[PDB]
RNA sequence: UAAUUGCGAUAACGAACGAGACCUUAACCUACUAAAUAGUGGUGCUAGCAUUUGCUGGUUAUCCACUUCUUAGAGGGACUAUCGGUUUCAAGCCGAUGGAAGUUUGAGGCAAUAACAGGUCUGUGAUGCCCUUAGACGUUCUGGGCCGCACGCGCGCUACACUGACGGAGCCAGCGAGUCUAACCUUGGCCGAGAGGUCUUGGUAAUCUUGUGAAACUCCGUCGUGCUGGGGAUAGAGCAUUGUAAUUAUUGCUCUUCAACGAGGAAUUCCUAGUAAGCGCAAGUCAUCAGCUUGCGUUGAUUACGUCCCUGCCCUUUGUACACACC
RNA sequence: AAUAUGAAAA
């Protein structure tokens, strides 16, 4: 019945120990990346940290810094800021 | 046991309780135990009036075959209550209307 | 369900059976009437009894 | 001196021990309950018993 | 893809092994009086509007 | 001579009449009072299992000791305070007075 | 109209006052400011590795002003946080007593607050006046 | 004495007392201005009563609010109900029923909880589960 | 209009864009109405709601949720998942970010595009798991508009959430492009592909 | 926090105390990858070396890093508190040490082998490969073996 | 109808326990009674800015006034109230109106006849019978053990990350507990990175801990899509506390170590709104120790509003070769 | 739709 033999309980010992591509974004700018950003952010009707990371291969942190400098140089216009996401446009006079 | 507990219910009822129930549980006739209830009148158990009226006590008695437990419940008459509600929460005692003869002639009584 | 129970109906009907002239169709007057004319033991039960009394008064007015 | 919470549960514990004592010592005298008086400078334990003269 | 609109005029209780669907007598907005009976998944009221992917399927019951 | 007289009871009714009669007695003696100030109720509760042995279904049960506290403030001369502290004694109402 | 700490937003008020202490330099920042965490309940030393002490002083200066008086115990409680007790669940742990004490003691040197009756420290008269001053400065640089 | 009413607002455990009196249009909560409230998102919610009425009706009312209890959202709701009902009491007691009624109709037509306290109360926890209804996991073997 | 000034100064835009008209934080409700005669009474749009947080009791009745503005329904189905329960502060912050992003991406009203998103990803048929002897057999049935709205909002939120998880893209913006894709009928939207797949299986199993 | 091009001086990877260190990650974590220095110790020595914390290790020059290594070998000379190091007291020398990489592994093995040879219970447990700090092994850690 | 709840029918009439009625708690009270152990306003005294007329504070022997908020005692209130549909046209139900609330208003307490050969003689000075009773199975002392680990199973606590992690800010609750002739809850000051140490302080408690200034939450910064600052298991070294005594590490802290874990197979648990869930707090045991439960509060969803399809329940009819009763 | 069996006495 329910009680197994000691030899069968030895199958507890016989159980044994058996059981059930990264992306390479920039993270550092160069002259070529610097040229790329000020030529393309005039495009990208919507600019944010994630969009810059996705479509310019910047390492996120430097994407944030570049956004502040793009703001300082005025090519960008704010819609909202937050300590975890920011929303930006091309400083468009169209809207 | 039978005569003794019947004496208790008879005593309590003539003493004026609205109901009583005495149960003896234990070995009694044979080794296997059973429980006998000798209730009479009527007893409530559930509603809060159980605290108000139901007096209860349990005592163990020890003899040669073992132990027996006696539970006594006594629903005292709420009408006799010197304190607490005079009657159960569902008691609705309507006061009878004093019969009035209809008057036909208007009249005025001077001072 | 709001189905009033047997005790409510007994007390309600008993009141009307002997206090029709003094009762009214207004819940408030019958409730404050009931408070003194019957020895109901709780406010909740009193309101239930009062409410059904007026319900039956409306019924009698119907026919 | 002692807090009110502790003081009154001590009263309860005191009453229970007294009630147990009286229900152990006064059963043959038809003991039926206790009420405890608490007065300034005085306290008295009133017993209810059928055999008052026997507990006397 | 073609569409057709319709309005429920009667609701006829629930249906489905677990009561999943509801019987609804539906009425098309276009070609009025062409009343139909449909099964509906989710809660509906009367005087409600439903878009049918097809019009003339019917059901008196469902498993 | 100011005194604060305070009441503690597990039962409401006895304590309430003590407060009412103490307040009314002092007033008919024209004694200044601060009314029957009522403290928050101390609801002691013990949470414990019903079953003694601990087998069977997990069921829990709470017992309550409600504790009521009252106190009244009087500025009163001693020779009448003799009567004030001894006028009313009732069961279950632990009463005590404090001078100032 | 008038100026009070309660009238300007906390965030701008506190960073303005922290920069003031950093710029003024009258504050006696302890040597261990670079070695220490704000409490054993945190897990990294501050990210403004130098201006954090000025931030703490500005915050504690604002809080003593807003309150009648506070002490180190309230300060540790207030700046404490949820500590990961490893695997075991987060437990609220107060801030570090020494650092929240030396901010008060350095704050005492500048004289913005004073030891007060009922224990603890109460915002001083002159400290209050200059606290309203920087409060005025914040609400004027807004526009 | 300057004319005044004294209205309370509550939501869950949070309470707020709203002293309303004739003044220069001054709005403060806990000794700090209404425009300073946090969380920033709920700022517009607290503006809702005065935003609907038009702030001209506060030109001559001075409202100061103290709030305690609850949390960072219950406090906001208590504040909104407190200033809502504070305006009502002032316009009932010292202005006219016409202003009171139009105000009350405007307030409710936007949102009932401006004047009526939310009836939801926290249901007591019961033995046998973390919450009021949830139970521990039933295991059969 | 008049710039009424109080002892407590209140900023100009708060008078302008909010007192003169009971807008959303930025956007209006006027001229915004669903393209579906079925959902006209279930989208709750064209009702002044203002901020997307409200402590109303929508659970007492079955259809009392049909009076909820769909933006609050969007916020609700946004926070539902797992560790995100409660935290409607984060929820409203995220939806506000999302409406900002939407109007950045396009000229139409963000509350208009979300409405078209709902009326576009609301499945119009679904097959119930109805039992049968031996093996269960499907049955295609029509769907209530309330179920349509609930399913559409549910599908939009998961299409947002499943894309947000474990990557750089933030929840607010992934929700926005999901919403724009749904409104314009893009199959790259998770909701639209799920909706017409459900209708596809219903069409097979009528 | 400025936009500036790193010149050719930037290198993508560097060597530090027999361990390779990633370049484009921040310097503090660049150090923490080393055995024997976690986030706390690495942040402290980075501050003590006074190098730019915000910069990535990829673009820092040798002079800062050689000083950094010197801080690691001799923290006691640079006023690092006694309590901050991972070998605050030694079981042979009254001096206070801090061991890095191969040294800490070799020292760990010595400590275990010291316990074993003196036949302490903890050393005996380590010899048999079991839990030593009192865990209930009944249900715990079956699969590590 | 939630209800053997009623309306009715009626060889039954009249009744009793149960349900209900009830009791407690949670929602309304500009009402009574009030309140230096709760407050508020005004006036004094005082501080700051305004410089000001206004604003925000400190100060009970500054006093005065008041009970809106807070505690309460007694009471009111809700009774499906009113309206419109719907049914022997009855009980009732549905919608709308008002209302603090219209699911028995919400949650509990109590909770019947009969029974199990359910759990306990390891709670009991409650005990029957048997054993034992002095090299005792009594009592007590020293040290282990109850934790021991090849494995299987059950409650859970952590996470597998950008709805975050981290740092610096904003920073708001409730239930509750606490010493005196014995030592609790501890404020404030000082010392120490920290735990903690030190000198005093209030509190037998709406008076002090304690506004328990909790966490989650929000705001600003480091990050970066990567087994990464996620996770911190695992081990070492060291520093204190409780305890006569920690060692087979009580527990806390510091540094270092940084494994599994990529949303989880067949299966399966719980849950209809302040409910699930997240988030902690108090009490319990406690000399120290929580991942445990009993409560409490913060934030606060989705989907139902139905069904008898799975598991079951209650009543009626039915069949039975079952009655220790479909095992 | 598939749904077999459950020792001896008491």
Curated annotation (Swiss-Prot), chain C:
GO terms for molecular function: structural constituent of ribosome. Its main location: cytoplasm. One of its GO terms (cellular component) is cytosol. GO terms for biological process: cytoplasmic translation; ribosomal small subunit assembly. The keyword Membrane does not apply. It comes from the Eukaryota. Keywords: Cytoplasm, Ribonucleoprotein, Ribosomal protein. It is found in: Cytoplasm. Component of the small ribosomal subunit (SSU). Mature yeast ribosomes consist of a small (40S) and a large (60S) subunit. The 40S small subunit contains 1 molecule of ribosomal RNA (18S rRNA) and 33 different proteins (encoded by 57 genes). The large 60S subunit contains 3 rRNA molecules (25S, 5.8S and 5S rRNA) and 46 different proteins (encoded by 81 genes). Component of the ribosome, a large ribonucleoprotein complex responsible for the synthesis of proteins in the cell. The small ribosomal subunit (SSU) binds messenger RNAs (mRNAs) and translates the encoded message by selecting cognate aminoacyl-transfer RNA (tRNA) molecules. The large subunit (LSU) contains the ribosomal catalytic site termed the peptidyl transferase center (PTC), which catalyzes the formation of peptide bonds, thereby polymerizing the amino acids delivered by tRNAs into a polypeptide chain. Present with 30900 molecules/cell in log phase SD medium. There are 2 genes for eS17 in yeast. Belongs to the eukaryotic ribosomal protein eS17 family. This is Small ribosomal subunit protein eS17A. The chain holds residues 2 to 64 of 136 of the full protein.
UniProtKB/Swiss-Prot annotation, chain G:
Gene3D superfamilies: Winged helix-like DNA-binding domain superfamily/Winged helix DNA-binding domain. Changing residue 56 to E/Q: Loss of mature 18S rRNA, protein doesn't bind 20S pre-RNA complex. Lethal in double RPS19A/RPS19B mutant. Keywords: Cytoplasm, Ribonucleoprotein, Ribosomal protein, Ribosome biogenesis. GO terms for cellular component: cytosol; cytosolic small ribosomal subunit. It is found in: Cytoplasm. Changing residue 121 to E: Decreases mature 18S rRNA, protein binds 20S pre-RNA complex poorly. Lethal in double RPS19A/RPS19B mutant. The keyword Ribonucleoprotein applies. Changing residue 101 to E: Decreases mature 18S rRNA, protein binds 20S pre-RNA complex poorly. Lethal in double RPS19A/RPS19B mutant. GO terms for molecular function: RNA binding; structural constituent of ribosome. GO terms for biological process: ribosomal small subunit assembly; ribosomal small subunit biogenesis; ribosomal subunit export from nucleus; translation. SMART domains: Ribosomal_S19e (SM01413). SUPFAM superfamilies: Winged helix' DNA-binding domain (SSF46785). The keyword Ribosomal protein applies. Present with 29000 molecules/cell in log phase SD medium. Component of the small ribosomal subunit (SSU). Mature yeast ribosomes consist of a small (40S) and a large (60S) subunit. The 40S small subunit contains 1 molecule of ribosomal RNA (18S rRNA) and 33 different proteins (encoded by 57 genes). The large 60S subunit contains 3 rRNA molecules (25S, 5.8S and 5S rRNA) and 46 different proteins (encoded by 81 genes). This is Small ribosomal subunit protein eS19A.
Swiss-Prot record, chain H:
GO terms for molecular function: RNA binding; structural constituent of ribosome. Keywords: Acetylation, Cytoplasm, Isopeptide bond, Phosphoprotein, Ribonucleoprotein, Ribosomal protein, Ubl conjugation. It comes from the Eukaryota. The modification Phosphothreonine is found at residue 68. InterPro entries: Ribosomal_Su5_D2-typ_SF, Ribosomal_uS9, Ribosomal_uS9_CS, Ribsml_uS5_D2-typ_fold_subgr. Residues 132-141 have a biased composition (Basic residues). Gene3D superfamilies: 3.30.230.10. GO terms for cellular component: 90S preribosome; cytosol; cytosolic small ribosomal subunit. Residues 121-141 are annotated as: Disordered. Its main location: cytoplasm. It holds the Pfam family Ribosomal_S9. It is found in: Cytoplasm. There is a cross-link at residues 28, 45, 57 (Glycyl lysine isopeptide (Lys-Gly) (interchain with G-Cter in ubiquitin)). The modification Phosphoserine is found at residues 32, 59, 74. GO terms for biological process: maturation of SSU-rRNA from tricistronic rRNA transcript (SSU-rRNA, 5.8S rRNA, LSU-rRNA); translational initiation. PANTHER family: RIBOSOMAL PROTEIN S16, RIBOSOMAL PROTEIN S9. Component of the ribosome, a large ribonucleoprotein complex responsible for the synthesis of proteins in the cell. The small ribosomal subunit (SSU) binds messenger RNAs (mRNAs) and translates the encoded message by selecting cognate aminoacyl-transfer RNA (tRNA) molecules. The large subunit (LSU) contains the ribosomal catalytic site termed the peptidyl transferase center (PTC), which catalyzes the formation of peptide bonds, thereby polymerizing the amino acids delivered by tRNAs into a polypeptide chain. Belongs to the universal ribosomal protein uS9 family. Present with 33800 molecules/cell in log phase SD medium. This is Small ribosomal subunit protein uS9A. The gene is RPS16A.
From Swiss-Prot, chain I:
Transmembrane segments: none annotated. It holds the Pfam family Ribosomal_S7. Disulfide bonds: none annotated. Keywords: Acetylation, Cytoplasm, Isopeptide bond, Phosphoprotein, Ribonucleoprotein, Ribosomal protein, Ubl conjugation. There is a cross-link at residues 26, 184 (Glycyl lysine isopeptide (Lys-Gly) (interchain with G-Cter in ubiquitin)). InterPro entries: Ribosomal_uS7, Ribosomal_uS7_CS, Ribosomal_uS7_dom, Ribosomal_uS7_dom_sf, Ribosomal_uS7_euk/arc. It is found in: Cytoplasm. The keyword Cytoplasm applies. One of its GO terms (cellular component) is cytosol. GO terms for biological process: cytoplasmic translation; maturation of SSU-rRNA; regulation of translational fidelity; ribosomal small subunit assembly; ribosomal subunit export from nucleus; translation. It comes from the Eukaryota. The modification Phosphothreonine is found at residue 8. Its main location: cytoplasm. The keyword Ribosomal protein applies. N-terminally acetylated by acetyltransferase NatA. One of its GO terms (molecular function) is structural constituent of ribosome. Belongs to the universal ribosomal protein uS7 family. Component of the ribosome, a large ribonucleoprotein complex responsible for the synthesis of proteins in the cell. The small ribosomal subunit (SSU) binds messenger RNAs (mRNAs) and translates the encoded message by selecting cognate aminoacyl-transfer RNA (tRNA) molecules. The large subunit (LSU) contains the ribosomal catalytic site termed the peptidyl transferase center (PTC), which catalyzes the formation of peptide bonds, thereby polymerizing the amino acids delivered by tRNAs into a polypeptide chain. This is Small ribosomal subunit protein uS7. It comes from Saccharomyces cerevisiae (strain ATCC 204508 / S288c).
């Amino acid at each position: 019945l329910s009680k197994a033999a000691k030899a069968a309980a030895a199958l507890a010992g016989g159980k044994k120990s058996k059981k059930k591509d990264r992306a390479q974004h920039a993270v550092i700018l160069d002259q070529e990346k610097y040229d790329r950003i000020l030529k393309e952010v005039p495009t990208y009707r919507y600019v944010s940290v994630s969009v810059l990371v996705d479509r310019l291969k910047i390492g996120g942190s430097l994407a944030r810094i570049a956004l502040r400098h793009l703001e300082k140089e005025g090519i960008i216009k704010p819609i909202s800021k937050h300590s975890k996401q920011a929303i930006y446009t091309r400083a468009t006079a169209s809207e | 046991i039978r005569r003794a507990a019947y004496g208790v219910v008879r005593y309590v009822m003539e003493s004026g309780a609205k109901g009583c129930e005495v149960v003896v549980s234990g070995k009694l006739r044979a080794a296997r135990a059973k429980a006998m209830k000798f209730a009479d009148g009527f007893l409530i158990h559930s509603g809060q009036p159980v605290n108000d009226f139901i007096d209860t006590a349990t005592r163990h008695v020890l003899m040669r075959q073992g132990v027996l437990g006696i539970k006594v419940k006594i629903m005292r008459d709420p009408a006799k209550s010197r304190t607490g509600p005079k009657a159960l929460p569902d008691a609705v005692t309507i006061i009878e209307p004093k019969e009035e003869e209809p008057i036909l002639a208007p009249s005025v009584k001077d001072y | 369900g709001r189905v009033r129970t047997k005790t409510v109906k007994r007390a309600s009907k008993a009141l009307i059976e002997r206090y029709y002239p003094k009762l009214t169709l207004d819940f408030q007057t019958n409730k404050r009437l009931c408070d003194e004319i019957a020895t109901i033991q709780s406010k909740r039960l009193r309101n239930k009894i009062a409410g059904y009394t007026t319900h039956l008064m409306k019924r009698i007015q119907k026919g | 001196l002692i807090s009110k919470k502790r003081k009154l549960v001590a009263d309860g514990v005191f009453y229970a021990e007294l009630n147990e004592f009286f229900t152990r010592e006064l059963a043959e005298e038809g003991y039926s309950g206790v009420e405890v008086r608490v007065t300034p400078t005085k306290t008295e334990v009133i017993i209810r018993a059928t055999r008052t003269q026997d507990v006397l | 893809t073609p569409v057709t609109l319709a309005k429920v005029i009667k609701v006829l209780g629930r249906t489905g092994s677990r009561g999943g669907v509801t019987q609804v007598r539906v009425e098309f907005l276009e070609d009025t009086s062409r009343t139909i009976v449909r099964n509906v998944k989710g809660p509906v009221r009367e005087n409600d509007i439903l878009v049918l992917m097809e019009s003339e399927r019917e059901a008196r019951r469902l498993r | 001579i100011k005194i604060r007289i305070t009441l503690t009871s597990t039962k409401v009714k006895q304590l309430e009449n003590v407060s009412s009669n103490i307040v009314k007695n002092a007033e008919q003696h024209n004694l200044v009072k601060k009314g029957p100030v009522r403290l928050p109720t101390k609801v002691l509760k013990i949470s414990t299992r019903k079953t003694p042995n601990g087998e069977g279904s997990k069921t829990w049960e709470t017992y309550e000791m409600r504790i009521h506290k009252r106190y009244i403030d009087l500025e009163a001369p001693v020779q009448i305070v003799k009567r004030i502290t001894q006028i009313t004694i009732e069961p279950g109402v632990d009463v005590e007075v404090v001078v100032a | 109209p008038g100026v009070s700490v309660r009238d300007v937003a906390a965030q701008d008020f506190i960073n303005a006052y922290a920069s003031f202490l950093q710029r003024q330099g009258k504050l006696e920042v302890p040597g261990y400011v670079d070695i220490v965490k704000t409490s054993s309940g945190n897990e990294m030393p501050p990210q403004d590795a130098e201006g954090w002490f000025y931030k703490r002083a500005a915050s504690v200066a604002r809080h003593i002003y807003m309150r009648k008086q506070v002490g180190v115990g309230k300060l540790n409680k207030l700046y404490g946080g949820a500590k990961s007790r490893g695997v075991r669940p987060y437990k609220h742990i107060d801030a570090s007593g020494s650092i929240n004490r030396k901010v008060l003691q350095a704050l005492e040197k500048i004289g913005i607050v004073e030891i007060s009756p009922k224990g603890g420290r109460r915002i001083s008269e002159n400290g209050q006046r200059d606290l309203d001053r920087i409060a005025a400065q914040t609400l004027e640089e807004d526009e | 004495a300057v004319p005044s009413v004294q209205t309370f607002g509550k939501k869950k455990s949070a309470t707020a007392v709203a002293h309303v009196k004739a003044g220069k249009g001054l709005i403060k909560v806990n000794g700090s201005p209404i425009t300073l409230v946090e969380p920033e998102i709920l700022r517009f919610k607290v503006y809702e009563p005065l935003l609907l009425v038009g702030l001209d009706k506060f030109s001559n009312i001075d409202i100061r609010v103290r709030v305690t209890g609850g949390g960072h959202v219950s406090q906001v709701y208590a504040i909104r109900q407190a200033i809502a009902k504070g305006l009502v009491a002032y316009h009932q007691k010292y202005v006219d029923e016409q202003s009171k009624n139009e105000l009350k109709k405007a307030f409710t037509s936007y949102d009932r909880t401006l004047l009526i306290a939310d009836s939801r109360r926290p249901e007591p926890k019961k033995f046998g589960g973390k919450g009021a209804r949830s139970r521990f996991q039933k295991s059969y073997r | 209009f008049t710039p009424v000034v109080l002892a407590t100064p209140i900023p100009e835009e708060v008078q302008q864009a909010q007192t003169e008209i009971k807008l959303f934080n930025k956007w209006s409700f006027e001229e915004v109405e669903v393209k579906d005669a079925s959902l006209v009474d279930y989208v709750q749009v064209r009702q002044p709601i203002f901020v997307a947080h409200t402590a109303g009791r929508y659970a007492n009745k079955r259809f009392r949720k049909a009076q909820c503005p769909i933006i609050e329904r969007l916020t609700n189905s946004l926070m539902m998942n797992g560790r995100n329960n409660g935290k409607k502060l984060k929820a409203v912050r995220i939806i506000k970010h999302t409406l900002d992003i939407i109007n950045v991406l396009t000229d139409q009203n963000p509350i208009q595009v979300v409405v078209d998103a709902i009326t576009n990803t609301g499945p119009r048929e679904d097959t119930t798991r109805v039992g049968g002897g031996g093996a269960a057999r499907r049955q295609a049935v029509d769907v209530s508009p309330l179920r349509r709205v609930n399913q559409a909002i549910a599908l939009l939120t998961i299409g947002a959430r499943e894309a947000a998880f474990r990557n750089i893209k933030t929840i607010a913006e992934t929700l926005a492009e999901e919403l724009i894709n749904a409104a314009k009928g893009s199959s790259t939207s998770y909701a639209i592909k799920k909706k017409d797949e459900l209708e596809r299986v219903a069409k097979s199993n009528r | 926090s400025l936009v500036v091009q790193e010149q050719g001086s930037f290198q993508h990877i560097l060597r530090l105390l027999n361990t390779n260190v990633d370049g484009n990650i921040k310097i503090v974590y660049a150090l923490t990858t080393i055995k024997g220095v976690g986030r706390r110790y690495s942040n402290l020595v980075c501050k003590k070396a006074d190098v730019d914390l915000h910069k990535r290790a990829g673009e820092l020059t040798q002079e800062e890093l050689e000083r950094i290594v010197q801080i690691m070998q001799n923290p006691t000379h640079y006023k690092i508190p006694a309590w901050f190091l991972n070998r605050q007291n030694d079981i042979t020398d009254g001096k206070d040490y801090h061991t890095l990489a191969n040294n800490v592994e070799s020292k760990l093995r010595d400590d275990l082998e010291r316990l074993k040879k003196i036949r302490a219970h903890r050393g005996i447990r380590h010899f048999w490969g079991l839990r030593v700090r009192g865990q209930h092994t009944k249900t715990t850690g079956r699969r590590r073996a």
